[PDB]
Amino acid sequence: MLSRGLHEQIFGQGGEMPGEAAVRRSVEHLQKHGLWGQPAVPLPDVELRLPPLYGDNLDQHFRLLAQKQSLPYLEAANLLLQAQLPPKPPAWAWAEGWTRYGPEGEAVPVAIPEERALVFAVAVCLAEGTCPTLAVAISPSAWYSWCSQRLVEERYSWTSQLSPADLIPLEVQEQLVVGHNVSFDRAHIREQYLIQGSRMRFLDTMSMHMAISGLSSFQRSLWIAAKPAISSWDWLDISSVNSLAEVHRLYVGGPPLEKEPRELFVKGTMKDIRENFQDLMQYCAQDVWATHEVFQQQLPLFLERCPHPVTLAGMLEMGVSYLPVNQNWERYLAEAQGTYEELQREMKKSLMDLANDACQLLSGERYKEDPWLWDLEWDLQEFSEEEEFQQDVMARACLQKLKGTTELLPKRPQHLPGHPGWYRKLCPRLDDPAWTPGPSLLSLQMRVTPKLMALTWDGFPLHYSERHGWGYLVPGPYNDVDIPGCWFFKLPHKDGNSCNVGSPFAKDFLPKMEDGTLQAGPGGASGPRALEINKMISFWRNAHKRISSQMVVWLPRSALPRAVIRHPDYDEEGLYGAILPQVVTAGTITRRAVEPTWLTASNARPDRVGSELKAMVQAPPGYTLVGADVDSQELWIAAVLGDAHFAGMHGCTAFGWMTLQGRKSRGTDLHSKTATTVGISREHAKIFNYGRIYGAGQPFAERLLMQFNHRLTQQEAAEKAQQMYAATKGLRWYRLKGGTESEMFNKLESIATSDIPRTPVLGCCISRALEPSAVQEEFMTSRVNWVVQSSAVDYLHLMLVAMKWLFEEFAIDGRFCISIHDEVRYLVREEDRYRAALALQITNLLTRCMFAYKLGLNDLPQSVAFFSAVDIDRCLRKEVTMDCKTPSNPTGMERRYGIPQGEALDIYQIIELTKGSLE
Amino acid sequence: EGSEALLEICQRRHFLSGSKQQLSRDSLLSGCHPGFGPLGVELRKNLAAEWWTSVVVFREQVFPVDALHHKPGPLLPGDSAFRLVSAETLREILQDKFLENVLKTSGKLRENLLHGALEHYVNCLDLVNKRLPYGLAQIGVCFHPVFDTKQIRNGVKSIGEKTEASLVWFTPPRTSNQWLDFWLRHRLQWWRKFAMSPSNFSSSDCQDEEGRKGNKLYYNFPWGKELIETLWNLGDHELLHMYPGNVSKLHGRDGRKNVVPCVLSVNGDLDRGMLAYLYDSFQTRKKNLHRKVLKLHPCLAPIKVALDVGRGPTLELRQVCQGLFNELLENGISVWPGYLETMQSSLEQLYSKYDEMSILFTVLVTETTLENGLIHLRSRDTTMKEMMHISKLKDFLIKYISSAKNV
Amino acid sequence: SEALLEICQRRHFLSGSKQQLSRDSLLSGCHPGFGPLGVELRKNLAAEWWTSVVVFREQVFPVDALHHKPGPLLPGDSAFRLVSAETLREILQDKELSKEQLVAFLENVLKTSGKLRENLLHGALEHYVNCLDLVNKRLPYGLAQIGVCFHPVFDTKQIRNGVKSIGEKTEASLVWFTPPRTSNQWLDFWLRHRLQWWRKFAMSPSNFSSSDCQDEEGRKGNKLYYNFPWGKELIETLWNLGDHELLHMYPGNVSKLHGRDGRKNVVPCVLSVNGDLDRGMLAYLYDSFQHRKVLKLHPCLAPIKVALDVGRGPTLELRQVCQGLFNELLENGISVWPGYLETMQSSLEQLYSKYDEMSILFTVLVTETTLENGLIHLRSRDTTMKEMMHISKLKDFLIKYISSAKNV
RNA sequence: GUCUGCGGCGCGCGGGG
DNA sequence: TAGATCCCGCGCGCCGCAGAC
């Protein structure tokens, strides 16, 4: 305890040699920068009984845990590595089910393959949905084929679980599976959608490809281009673009893999597949062979580049995710689409009304003085008492007949003469193309909609004259930025926005509706609503394709476990299903998982139609989601790395001091307290702070500050050097980034340029393409981002292995890890749910301590040794006490309220009989 | 200030409401107005037709029912507000000896029409073979008591009239919640239809003192939100109350089980909704548009097209309008019969008059119509004039209305 | 002639318990309301009346008449069906009485609170001025309205001393203001048109008749009876009441209630046409009766036009076609009885008998042959010939049949 | 035959994550 | 940091097919 605040521990030797010089340096550094005298509020002491560790340290403990987890699958991988492949069969069978191809092309029908290791590949035809159509697999014994039983002409209309393949023996034990994009394949394997866990684990050669000589995002534009612009070109011979053909060519020496030109899978029909059965089967077998070769060449490279066994166990555990829905998913997709349609109609009706009202300014040439619509055409082109009268002509004076013309009426030769030219363009043809009244064919994307709506900033000429929305848009020929308009345009000027489209400039008008000089103005009735409708709609507009068409598999009644029975929520005409996230265990330059529709930073936000996507992940009866978010993961990691480079005590480098002592409420933390006070914007500083620990540069800081508000370049990050002067005081010389400020990021640069594996915790290696030794380059920022994100994914792996070990040690029905933006959620049975929380807290004790064990450290602050809270809910959401916007309320869904626990979970024990409550 | 005061002019003036110089919003909201003008009656009729088509038509298991405007005499507990006075002033009992003063065993006018539907449930159960999910719909006038709350300025309670459209839906208790949500959504969408600013039609959730839930729909008038429609989940309390003798006769079949249905009542005010649509159709500051016009939806505007003549060398050739008028009278296209006033009215005044009357199209027959007949067609939405041809007018109008009916 | 009321009670043409409506009490409004089929038949009849009288005349406009007349200090000489007629607690007629200070002539009673209307003429007379303002002073024009009116009932002892009852009648009224000259010509014109309209939908128009009557309040009067099987009831009344009633209203001021006829200012003469839509429905339903039990209502008045059903075949892959046809028919404005979802597979002969008793123009049956080549079965209501016809053209055939029936 | 409606075919410019 | 490029979606032409004056 004491020593400026440290934790209570039951493991580790006495040691405790802080060093008088180190303590003196820390103290004299703390006198400057942050204040030194701070008694603070010491936290309550916690006494706990951790389970027996293995080895003389905790590093050996984690090593043994990783080996124990990975041995049953490492043996299978080694078996596949040295396996001898027999020749491919001459003719592929057509019989339903699984067919084994023994030597001489001997086809034998079998129920399932009895193999401990294989490479799998599954193909789908988009015509009949996403159901699999054919699959070919290889093993050390022989080859296997599966024809998907689609040969029969039978209607099923989706909503089935027998459609995918079968690969898990009933065993009434290891089941390693390898492949390329193996997540997609395991979506069509079946028995992975069961609520019960399974012993089969999946390896994706893409994640061994990203880990070994991965390709950066910036480097991709030059890699494709060569399949202050001076740069080295020594890195293109070691990196690929994640495609199967390029990866096989780079990693395996052989001819390039041919690609099928017809591409009947994406565009075709089942009849074409039947006609092209043989060639497509051969292509699939070729892809499987290529993947097998890449896996064989990469497995020893994978072990060498990641010597620590924990990485492989983490990838194995990461590859098994599970997202139950319980019949609300397809219901959620219909409501969202309906609301999208009504808002589109409502905004479409508003635009038509604006267009109709815009016709009035031609009555007296009043559009000449209109600042908005002055430049349009407005060109109109001309070119028997009752029997005697009861009938009369009887056909509206039938003597009148059509003389001449008879061409203008049909189609659009004389389309609505007299109307304005632009209005004529908007309207459809009179009769033929399913005529709808009014100025239809008008949408947000046309050049005239801004001319009818918005027109803010004092100008909004949304024209495509090489400048998009023109304007100087600031104070000081004539009418350059004047309100009335009617500019002469004697000489064009792209003032104000000098970058033009040089900047990324993406999605910047959605938050500029709130003030931001973005509104309609004179209308006051239908102008602003259209902008507000667009603001609600923009998310779903471009996310409905991915969010919809998610492959949902509904389990049958018989396959349900005994957890569902005996519970009140049983058989209410209920359809239980699961969504496999189809997430690559590593899809970026680092090992961070990538998923475009499940690993994104978004939550249930108001005024957004498609929000609350993360919700409606409803666990089945008898189960609940226990989850936790790591408090300040990368900030703390960078701070402790700097501290370790500086001294032993964590409160030494003066960055960790603010990280630990600083608080969001009544505290000068870098998130919304310190940087906001130094800067201008509020709550955007938590992005600016991350944009310096991830290792950006001053130009990027200036650009990012510019996107926050409208200021001139002098007040950008060129003269306003207060942030770059402080924090990352870079370009420090005459000292032998190093020193002279409160943040120690020089360690990250030293790690990058050290030629080691460059992972200070578990020693996972860097991509060969970005090494200075392999290729000298000035991509320092990318490398420091690489190391910090590496530490993050190294942290996630440690939690995953620890949680797996703690679950398998005891009789805890908890599995199916899900990682989303530094937030781990597991599905656990209710009867043990509190215990599932407890272990999670203990995980953060070891994981943090592991980060505190290497690099010559032996102590950790008390506060960071535990999670702030553990959310135990029945659905996935950022916080327990939140609601939804588009539906009536969360009560519309079956979303009850959980219990974040906190200190309550710490009162129990890790044994099955907690405080006598159980049994 | 041009809102709710400039609109009333060009309403009683264009005979969309009873003209007496009322100029009272509270009178209209309470139902004590003298009445609606012929255009107002037509607009209310169109709105009732749309409600009927959307609720009971295009919806199986919904049937009509009629409830009397008055209820029987006896077995009527309770009493009126002013009839409940016995505090003092009993000096004169000179009268010798129903009669009496304790409610006189007298009948009452109906305040809500759901009582009649609940009475008719048992008879209306045989036509669905006791299939539980089914509704009874009815549009009718309801009588309410209203007063200024000024001493007794009007003395006896004033009596207000409101055309209420009620659907009473009997549903299984298990499925009551989703049916309630579906009805709320459907009614909200229907109201948001025919609206230039559908956002002004808002909804909210409410709960009864018995814990029963329901929804309230409001229209945002210029002065504030006013209730238009109410949905309530009665939960078979009153249905069981009116039939306490036995429940075997009351059991209906849902799926394969006999159960007492739950009752959901949705009641909307057609007069308040008609006023809401009138306000919505009308438009303010720095607009630079002017041109007062009631932009009512084509599907419920009172008059569709206006016929007229102009620059007629022969008024004997005005007979061309006749028959064509009749041609529009077939298939139910309503026409304003003009070309009869024979006044020196300029085209601009006629156009303004037709705009204020919510007339979609102005058809003018000119001297050049006798040969290669062309009839100047002007549009309400945009003030531009077409030529078109005679023989294609009717279908075009039909098509226009049809295209307005859906999207 | 007899046993008709039982057929009315069944199939819900008249809503009520066993023999509650009975023979009497139907002429008066003191009876339970109509069933859904009766309500729809009334709606169709009212629509036909509106089309024939209002829309086709181009000089008759709707008028809104309230169900109550507050009548500040109302005169003491009237029927007084509802002396109170305020919110609840209607005190009937209460002849004499009200001698005590409590509930004296002042405050309540003495018709001070208001009255419930018994005729639609007063509202038209009140809207007369505004409707001239709308017509621009062109004298010959009318005001039409369909609405409920309340009358007193007597005799028919209910309990001991007569307690009376609110006879409710849905009446269609036209008030026609025409110049005093040629007022009789307008009377004959309207009498002829109304009689033709009433005979248009009649299976046996000879039953519909007319008679003349003379009184002192009006110059001449006509009455339409229909000659019900028991006798001649009264279904419509036309009165040439005269300008005198218009004069009693607006007693003050002059040159305000006169309008322009023939470029001459004249005080109009009013004719009142009043038809009983309830009794009209009863008359049409009676004449539709006729040795199978079938109600041969007119195609333009029948509550249900066509009906859908399934004949044998699989339960599934047949509701789709029936639902599509149902949606198409309703989109085209033809009322259809959805009998396809009916379970238990009722007897075919019993089904046809029930469908005929409900007065359905055509019975449509869908079988597997529709799935083969889209050929439904079709049975006519009156000819009872069954024929095969294409499913796609059913809507066209039905609308053509309706139009042909409408035309004479 | 004219620029007047009706097709093909190219070309730009920008957002998406 | 990391930033992204095929991918629609919206604008321009040139080349031809028709057609009434």
Side-chain angles (χ1 to χ4, degrees), chain B residues 65-72 108-113 115-117 120 138 140-143, chain C residues 15 29-34 42 148 150 165-170 278:
Chain B
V65 80
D66 70 322
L68 308 181
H69 294 68
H70 88 289
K71 309 183 181 323
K108 53 164 284 180
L109 292 173
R110 57 159 200 234
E111 274 228 24
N112 62 338
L113 56 166
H115 196 92
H120 283 297
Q138 182 179 189
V141 84
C142 287
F143 315 86
Chain C
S15 75
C30 46
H31 74 134
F34 298 131
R42 203 229 308 280
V148 185
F150 314 89
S165 179
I166 272 45
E168 266 161 305
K169 303 188 180 184
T170 313
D278 292 80

Short mmCIF file of all heavy atoms in Angstrom, two decimals, chain B residues 65-72 108-113 115-117 120 138 140-143, chain C residues 15 29-34 42 148 150 165-170 278:
data_model
loop_
_atom_site.label_atom_id
_atom_site.label_comp_id
_atom_site.label_asym_id
_atom_site.label_seq_id
_atom_site.Cartn_x
_atom_site.Cartn_y
_atom_site.Cartn_z
N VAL B 65 -72.16 -1.53 -37.72
CA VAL B 65 -73.15 -1.63 -36.66
C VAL B 65 -73.74 -0.24 -36.44
O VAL B 65 -73.07 0.77 -36.63
CB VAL B 65 -72.55 -2.20 -35.35
CG1 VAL B 65 -71.79 -1.12 -34.58
CG2 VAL B 65 -73.65 -2.81 -34.50
N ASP B 66 -75.01 -0.21 -36.05
CA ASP B 66 -75.73 1.04 -35.78
C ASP B 66 -76.11 1.08 -34.31
O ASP B 66 -76.64 0.10 -33.77
CB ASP B 66 -76.97 1.17 -36.67
CG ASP B 66 -78.06 0.18 -36.30
OD1 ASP B 66 -77.72 -0.97 -35.96
OD2 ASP B 66 -79.25 0.56 -36.34
N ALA B 67 -75.84 2.22 -33.67
CA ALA B 67 -76.20 2.45 -32.28
C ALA B 67 -77.18 3.62 -32.22
O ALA B 67 -76.94 4.66 -32.85
CB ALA B 67 -74.97 2.75 -31.43
N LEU B 68 -78.26 3.45 -31.47
CA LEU B 68 -79.28 4.48 -31.38
C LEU B 68 -78.70 5.73 -30.72
O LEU B 68 -77.77 5.67 -29.91
CB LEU B 68 -80.48 3.97 -30.58
CG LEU B 68 -81.07 2.64 -31.02
CD1 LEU B 68 -82.26 2.28 -30.15
CD2 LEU B 68 -81.48 2.68 -32.49
N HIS B 69 -79.26 6.89 -31.09
CA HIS B 69 -78.81 8.14 -30.50
C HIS B 69 -79.26 8.32 -29.06
O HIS B 69 -78.77 9.23 -28.39
CB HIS B 69 -79.31 9.32 -31.34
CG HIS B 69 -78.72 9.39 -32.71
ND1 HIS B 69 -79.00 8.46 -33.68
CD2 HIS B 69 -77.86 10.28 -33.26
CE1 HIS B 69 -78.34 8.77 -34.78
NE2 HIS B 69 -77.64 9.87 -34.55
N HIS B 70 -80.17 7.47 -28.57
CA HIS B 70 -80.67 7.55 -27.21
C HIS B 70 -80.70 6.15 -26.61
O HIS B 70 -80.78 5.15 -27.33
CB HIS B 70 -82.07 8.16 -27.16
CG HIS B 70 -83.16 7.16 -27.33
ND1 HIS B 70 -83.42 6.53 -28.53
CD2 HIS B 70 -84.07 6.66 -26.45
CE1 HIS B 70 -84.43 5.69 -28.39
NE2 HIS B 70 -84.84 5.75 -27.13
N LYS B 71 -80.64 6.10 -25.29
CA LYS B 71 -80.68 4.85 -24.54
C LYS B 71 -82.03 4.68 -23.84
O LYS B 71 -82.75 5.65 -23.63
CB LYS B 71 -79.56 4.80 -23.50
CG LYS B 71 -78.18 5.12 -24.07
CD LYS B 71 -77.09 4.99 -23.00
CE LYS B 71 -75.70 5.33 -23.54
NZ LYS B 71 -75.46 4.87 -24.94
N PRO B 72 -82.41 3.43 -23.49
CA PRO B 72 -83.69 3.21 -22.81
C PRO B 72 -83.89 4.07 -21.56
O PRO B 72 -82.95 4.69 -21.06
CB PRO B 72 -83.64 1.72 -22.43
CG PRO B 72 -82.62 1.10 -23.31
CD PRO B 72 -81.88 2.17 -24.05
N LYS B 108 -81.44 8.91 -21.84
CA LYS B 108 -80.33 9.83 -22.04
C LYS B 108 -79.80 9.72 -23.46
O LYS B 108 -79.86 8.65 -24.07
CB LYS B 108 -79.19 9.56 -21.05
CG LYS B 108 -78.71 8.12 -21.03
CD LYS B 108 -77.35 7.98 -20.34
CE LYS B 108 -76.21 8.45 -21.23
NZ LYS B 108 -74.89 8.31 -20.55
N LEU B 109 -79.28 10.83 -23.96
CA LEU B 109 -78.55 10.81 -25.22
C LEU B 109 -77.19 10.16 -25.02
O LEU B 109 -76.59 10.25 -23.94
CB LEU B 109 -78.38 12.23 -25.75
CG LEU B 109 -79.65 12.95 -26.21
CD1 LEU B 109 -79.35 14.39 -26.55
CD2 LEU B 109 -80.28 12.24 -27.40
N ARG B 110 -76.69 9.52 -26.07
CA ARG B 110 -75.43 8.79 -25.97
C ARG B 110 -74.25 9.76 -26.00
O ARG B 110 -74.20 10.67 -26.83
CB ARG B 110 -75.31 7.76 -27.10
CG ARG B 110 -75.43 8.32 -28.52
CD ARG B 110 -74.80 7.38 -29.54
NE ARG B 110 -74.48 8.08 -30.79
CZ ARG B 110 -74.88 7.73 -32.01
NH1 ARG B 110 -75.62 6.65 -32.22
NH2 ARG B 110 -74.50 8.47 -33.04
N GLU B 111 -73.31 9.57 -25.08
CA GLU B 111 -72.07 10.32 -25.07
C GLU B 111 -70.98 9.63 -25.88
O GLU B 111 -70.14 10.31 -26.48
CB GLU B 111 -71.57 10.50 -23.63
CG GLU B 111 -72.14 11.72 -22.90
CD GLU B 111 -71.09 12.57 -22.18
OE1 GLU B 111 -69.91 12.54 -22.57
OE2 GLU B 111 -71.46 13.26 -21.21
N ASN B 112 -70.99 8.30 -25.91
CA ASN B 112 -70.06 7.51 -26.70
C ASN B 112 -70.83 6.37 -27.34
O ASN B 112 -71.81 5.88 -26.78
CB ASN B 112 -68.92 6.96 -25.83
CG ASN B 112 -69.43 6.03 -24.74
OD1 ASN B 112 -70.59 6.09 -24.35
ND2 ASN B 112 -68.55 5.18 -24.24
N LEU B 113 -70.37 5.95 -28.52
CA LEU B 113 -71.07 4.93 -29.29
C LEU B 113 -70.52 3.53 -29.06
O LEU B 113 -71.01 2.59 -29.68
CB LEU B 113 -71.05 5.25 -30.79
CG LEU B 113 -69.74 5.48 -31.57
CD1 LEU B 113 -70.04 5.42 -33.05
CD2 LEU B 113 -69.06 6.80 -31.25
N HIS B 115 -70.83 1.84 -26.31
CA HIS B 115 -71.81 1.08 -25.55
C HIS B 115 -72.72 0.29 -26.48
O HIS B 115 -73.01 -0.89 -26.21
CB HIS B 115 -72.63 2.03 -24.67
CG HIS B 115 -73.39 1.34 -23.59
ND1 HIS B 115 -72.88 1.14 -22.33
CD2 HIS B 115 -74.64 0.81 -23.58
CE1 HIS B 115 -73.77 0.52 -21.58
NE2 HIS B 115 -74.85 0.30 -22.32
N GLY B 116 -73.16 0.90 -27.57
CA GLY B 116 -73.98 0.18 -28.53
C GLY B 116 -73.24 -0.98 -29.16
O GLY B 116 -73.81 -2.06 -29.35
N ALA B 117 -71.97 -0.77 -29.51
CA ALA B 117 -71.18 -1.86 -30.07
C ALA B 117 -71.04 -3.01 -29.08
O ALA B 117 -71.21 -4.18 -29.45
CB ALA B 117 -69.80 -1.34 -30.48
N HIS B 120 -74.08 -4.92 -29.09
CA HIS B 120 -74.23 -5.68 -30.32
C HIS B 120 -73.21 -6.79 -30.48
O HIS B 120 -73.28 -7.53 -31.46
CB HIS B 120 -74.13 -4.74 -31.53
CG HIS B 120 -75.36 -3.94 -31.78
ND1 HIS B 120 -76.57 -4.52 -32.10
CD2 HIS B 120 -75.57 -2.60 -31.77
CE1 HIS B 120 -77.48 -3.57 -32.27
NE2 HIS B 120 -76.90 -2.40 -32.07
N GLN B 138 -68.31 2.16 -36.62
CA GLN B 138 -69.48 3.01 -36.77
C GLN B 138 -69.06 4.47 -36.69
O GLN B 138 -68.26 4.85 -35.84
CB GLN B 138 -70.52 2.70 -35.69
CG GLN B 138 -71.80 3.52 -35.78
CD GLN B 138 -72.85 3.18 -34.72
OE1 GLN B 138 -73.98 3.66 -34.81
NE2 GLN B 138 -72.49 2.38 -33.72
N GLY B 140 -70.88 8.16 -36.12
CA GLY B 140 -72.14 8.74 -35.69
C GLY B 140 -71.90 9.95 -34.82
O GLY B 140 -70.79 10.19 -34.35
N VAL B 141 -72.96 10.72 -34.62
CA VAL B 141 -72.87 11.92 -33.81
C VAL B 141 -72.97 11.55 -32.34
O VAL B 141 -73.71 10.63 -31.96
CB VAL B 141 -73.96 12.93 -34.22
CG1 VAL B 141 -75.28 12.63 -33.52
CG2 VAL B 141 -73.50 14.35 -33.92
N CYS B 142 -72.23 12.27 -31.50
CA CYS B 142 -72.26 12.12 -30.06
C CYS B 142 -72.55 13.46 -29.42
O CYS B 142 -72.07 14.51 -29.87
CB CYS B 142 -70.95 11.56 -29.52
SG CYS B 142 -70.71 9.82 -29.90
N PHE B 143 -73.35 13.41 -28.35
CA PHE B 143 -73.85 14.56 -27.63
C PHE B 143 -73.08 14.69 -26.33
O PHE B 143 -73.00 13.73 -25.56
CB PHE B 143 -75.34 14.40 -27.34
CG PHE B 143 -76.14 13.90 -28.52
CD1 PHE B 143 -76.27 12.54 -28.77
CD2 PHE B 143 -76.80 14.78 -29.35
CE1 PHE B 143 -77.01 12.08 -29.83
CE2 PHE B 143 -77.54 14.33 -30.42
CZ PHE B 143 -77.65 12.98 -30.66
N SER C 15 -81.40 -6.57 -36.45
CA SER C 15 -80.75 -6.98 -35.22
C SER C 15 -81.78 -7.02 -34.09
O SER C 15 -82.54 -6.07 -33.90
CB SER C 15 -79.61 -6.03 -34.86
OG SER C 15 -80.11 -4.81 -34.35
N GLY C 29 -89.91 3.88 -35.02
CA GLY C 29 -88.51 3.65 -34.74
C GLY C 29 -88.21 3.03 -33.40
O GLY C 29 -87.04 2.87 -33.06
N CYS C 30 -89.23 2.67 -32.62
CA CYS C 30 -89.03 2.08 -31.30
C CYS C 30 -88.75 0.58 -31.46
O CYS C 30 -89.59 -0.28 -31.22
CB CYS C 30 -90.24 2.32 -30.41
SG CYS C 30 -91.82 2.00 -31.21
N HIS C 31 -87.53 0.29 -31.89
CA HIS C 31 -87.08 -1.09 -32.07
C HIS C 31 -85.56 -1.10 -32.03
O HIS C 31 -84.92 -0.06 -32.22
CB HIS C 31 -87.59 -1.68 -33.39
CG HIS C 31 -86.86 -1.15 -34.60
ND1 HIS C 31 -86.41 -1.98 -35.60
CD2 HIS C 31 -86.52 0.11 -34.95
CE1 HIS C 31 -85.81 -1.24 -36.53
NE2 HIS C 31 -85.87 0.02 -36.16
N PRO C 32 -84.95 -2.27 -31.79
CA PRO C 32 -83.49 -2.34 -31.88
C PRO C 32 -83.02 -2.09 -33.30
O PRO C 32 -83.74 -2.34 -34.27
CB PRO C 32 -83.18 -3.78 -31.43
CG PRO C 32 -84.38 -4.24 -30.70
CD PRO C 32 -85.54 -3.55 -31.35
N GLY C 33 -81.80 -1.58 -33.42
CA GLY C 33 -81.25 -1.21 -34.71
C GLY C 33 -81.15 -2.37 -35.69
O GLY C 33 -81.51 -3.50 -35.37
N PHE C 34 -80.65 -2.08 -36.89
CA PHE C 34 -80.51 -3.09 -37.93
C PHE C 34 -79.19 -3.85 -37.77
O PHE C 34 -78.26 -3.39 -37.10
CB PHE C 34 -80.55 -2.43 -39.31
CG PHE C 34 -81.84 -1.73 -39.61
CD1 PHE C 34 -81.84 -0.43 -40.10
CD2 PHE C 34 -83.05 -2.36 -39.41
CE1 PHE C 34 -83.02 0.21 -40.38
CE2 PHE C 34 -84.24 -1.71 -39.69
CZ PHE C 34 -84.22 -0.43 -40.17
N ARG C 42 -79.00 0.05 -46.01
CA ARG C 42 -79.37 1.45 -45.79
C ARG C 42 -78.34 2.39 -46.39
O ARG C 42 -78.69 3.41 -46.99
CB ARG C 42 -79.53 1.72 -44.30
CG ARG C 42 -80.42 2.91 -43.98
CD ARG C 42 -79.78 3.86 -42.97
NE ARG C 42 -79.32 3.18 -41.77
CZ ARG C 42 -80.11 2.81 -40.76
NH1 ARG C 42 -81.41 3.02 -40.78
NH2 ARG C 42 -79.56 2.22 -39.70
N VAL C 148 -81.22 11.42 -38.99
CA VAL C 148 -82.15 10.78 -38.08
C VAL C 148 -83.06 11.84 -37.47
O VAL C 148 -82.62 12.95 -37.15
CB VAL C 148 -81.40 10.00 -36.98
CG1 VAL C 148 -82.38 9.23 -36.11
CG2 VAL C 148 -80.39 9.06 -37.62
N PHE C 150 -86.49 12.22 -34.56
CA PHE C 150 -87.08 11.61 -33.37
C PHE C 150 -88.54 12.02 -33.27
O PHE C 150 -88.86 13.21 -33.38
CB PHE C 150 -86.32 12.04 -32.11
CG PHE C 150 -84.83 11.97 -32.25
CD1 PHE C 150 -84.11 13.05 -32.73
CD2 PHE C 150 -84.14 10.82 -31.90
CE1 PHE C 150 -82.74 12.99 -32.86
CE2 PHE C 150 -82.77 10.75 -32.03
CZ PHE C 150 -82.07 11.84 -32.51
N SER C 165 -91.89 6.67 -26.21
CA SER C 165 -90.60 6.18 -26.67
C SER C 165 -90.12 7.09 -27.79
O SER C 165 -90.91 7.78 -28.44
CB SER C 165 -90.69 4.73 -27.15
OG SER C 165 -89.43 4.28 -27.61
N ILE C 166 -88.80 7.08 -28.01
CA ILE C 166 -88.19 7.92 -29.02
C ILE C 166 -88.14 7.12 -30.31
O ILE C 166 -87.20 6.35 -30.54
CB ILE C 166 -86.79 8.40 -28.57
CG1 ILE C 166 -86.87 9.70 -27.76
CG2 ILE C 166 -85.88 8.74 -29.75
CD1 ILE C 166 -87.96 9.73 -26.71
N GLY C 167 -89.19 7.22 -31.13
CA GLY C 167 -89.12 6.61 -32.44
C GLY C 167 -88.07 7.29 -33.29
O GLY C 167 -88.20 8.48 -33.60
N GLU C 168 -87.03 6.56 -33.67
CA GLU C 168 -85.95 7.09 -34.50
C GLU C 168 -86.14 6.64 -35.94
O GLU C 168 -86.25 5.44 -36.21
CB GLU C 168 -84.59 6.62 -33.99
CG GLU C 168 -83.91 7.59 -33.04
CD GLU C 168 -82.84 6.92 -32.21
OE1 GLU C 168 -83.15 5.92 -31.54
OE2 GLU C 168 -81.69 7.40 -32.23
N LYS C 169 -86.18 7.60 -36.86
CA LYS C 169 -86.37 7.32 -38.28
C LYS C 169 -85.28 8.02 -39.08
O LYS C 169 -85.10 9.24 -38.93
CB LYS C 169 -87.74 7.79 -38.75
CG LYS C 169 -88.90 7.17 -37.99
CD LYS C 169 -90.23 7.51 -38.63
CE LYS C 169 -91.39 6.90 -37.87
NZ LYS C 169 -92.69 7.16 -38.55
N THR C 170 -84.57 7.27 -39.92
CA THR C 170 -83.59 7.87 -40.82
C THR C 170 -84.34 8.37 -42.05
O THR C 170 -84.79 7.57 -42.88
CB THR C 170 -82.51 6.87 -41.21
OG1 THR C 170 -82.03 6.20 -40.04
CG2 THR C 170 -81.35 7.58 -41.89
N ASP C 278 -85.71 4.16 -43.64
CA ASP C 278 -85.95 2.91 -42.92
C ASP C 278 -87.14 2.17 -43.52
O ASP C 278 -87.05 0.97 -43.83
CB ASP C 278 -86.19 3.20 -41.44
CG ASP C 278 -84.96 3.71 -40.74
OD1 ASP C 278 -84.67 4.92 -40.87
OD2 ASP C 278 -84.28 2.92 -40.05
#
